[PDB]
Antibody, heavy 219, light 211 residues
């Protein structure tokens, strides 16, 4: 019944600060915790607040850079983390405990808020065709693609022929380069006989830079 | 602070045990809670106060606690159960909550599958922009672990390589990508470049060459 809704994703420069909100959609004698998860990592407790006792608790790892508050008028809890570093890149979760102890299980969870910390700046991608040839042809089917190079931040979305072509499409998760920029590729396998009769275009959308590219991919 | 097996393998409708090992100041004197995390979503409470079941959680899950270690049990193991599992408890010496590192429940077993590998050379459009990227796309492999090595000629190269972690596909097999960055002159100067993909001790190599 009760839902916890968190503010949206954030992209932050090292040394800055982020404040994430967690609004209780309805349903307050419960403790609230903040828990983060670095990509491909486990869960880490940041601290909590118990609004009806007006007391908070911070893990000592974060103490001096974290603040957890709760606003009773709107039953919104907040977690502010300052002096951000690249290792603070994570999904941040808000969760409500089953009672007023932090010992109790966390039975209601927000949806998570992605926070990315990086020194990179918003940049649209350069899109290159990956042309089909004899060397990407096997058994009468041809592989062709798009290389979406050097963009920041995530996400990019890719479609083929404005959505009319879906089967045979494999859009790969991006690599994060040492430059701080991302690159990904998208490929589609099609009948080799269709190369003279059908045109193939990848539609790349990079909303953070307000950029869309339609790239024709020819033999 | 708490330790779990990083991975756990078993077959359908079997029974699995996930151990959680702590110390006196956390598991020893505090309740243990278990969380299930499905891919790409928020953790969910599975077990609370050592052994109680939330509403809506299947009877197949159970927890127990003895001394400074705890254990989660799943019986009648099913495909839905593949997920990460975390134990958690309060710690009176850290005065905070601690989790275990988590346990991936690989529910057995999908057929082994060899990677399909496609290697693209740099586009003329990119070379004309004075850069060159070799793109090696690796799909449909199981289980989800590969290593990728590149060769300039028949000589290894490790400069300019960026490889992704593997990621699970729609069909429950895995995919990865690897990129080799070169100058337009490294590209033309050699007679070929190769992407070599090793999967479960066996290797598939694709080769490309300037026009």
């Amino acid at each position: 019944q009760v839902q916890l809704v968190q503010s949206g994703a954030e992209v932050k420069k090292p040394g800055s600060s982020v404040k994430v909100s967690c609004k209780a959609s309805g349903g307050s004698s419960y403790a609230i915790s903040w828990v983060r998860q670095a990509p491909g990592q486990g869960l880490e407790w940041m601290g909590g607040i118990i609004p009806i006792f007006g007391t908070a608790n911070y893990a000592q790892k974060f103490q001096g850079r974290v603040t957890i508050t709760a606003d009773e008028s709107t039953s919104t809890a907040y977690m502010e983390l300052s002096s951000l570093r690249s290792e603070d890149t994570a999904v941040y979760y808000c969760a409500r405990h089953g009672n007023y102890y932090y010992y109790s299980g966390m039975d209601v969870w927000g949806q998570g808020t992605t926070v990315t910390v990086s020194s990179a700046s918003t940049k649209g991608p350069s899109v290159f065709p990956l042309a089909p040839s004899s060397k990407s042809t096997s058994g009468g089917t041809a592989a062709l693609g798009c290389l979406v190079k050097d963009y920041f931040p995530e996400p990019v979305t890719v479609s083929w022929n404005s959505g009319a072509l879906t089967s045979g499409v494999h859009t790969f998760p991006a690599v994060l380069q040492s430059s701080g920029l991302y690159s990904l590729s998208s490929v589609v396998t099609v009948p080799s006989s269709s190369l003279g009769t059908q045109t193939y275009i990848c539609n790349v959308n990079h909303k953070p830079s307000n950029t869309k590219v339609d790239k024709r991919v020819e033999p | 602070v708490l330790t779990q097996p990083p991975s756990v393998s078993e077959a359908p409708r079997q029974r699995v045990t996930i151990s959680c090992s702590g110390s006196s100041s956390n598991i020893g004197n505090n309740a243990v809670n278990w969380y299930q995390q499905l891919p790409g979503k928020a953790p969910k409470l599975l077990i609370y106060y050592d052994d109680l079941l939330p509403s809506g959680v299947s009877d197949r899950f159970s927890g127990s606690k003895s001394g400074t270690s705890a254990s989660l049990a799943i019986s009648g193991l099913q495909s839905e159960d593949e997920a990460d599992y975390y134990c958690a408890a309060w710690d009176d010496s850290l005065n905070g909550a601690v989790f275990g590192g988590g346990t991936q429940l690989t529910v057995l077993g999908q057929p082994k599958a060899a990677p399909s590998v496609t290697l693209f050379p740099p586009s003329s459009e990119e070379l004309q922009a004075n850069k060159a990227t070799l793109v090696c796309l690796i799909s449909d492999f199981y289980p989800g672990a590969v290593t990728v090595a590149w060769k300039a000629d028949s000589s290894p190269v490790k400069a300019g390589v960026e490889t992704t972690t593997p990621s699970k596909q729609s069909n429950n097999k895995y995919a990865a990508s690897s990129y080799l960055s070169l100058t337009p002159e490294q590209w033309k100067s050699h007679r070929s470049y190769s992407c070599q993909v090793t999967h479960e001790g066996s290797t598939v190599e694709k080769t490309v060459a300037p026009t």
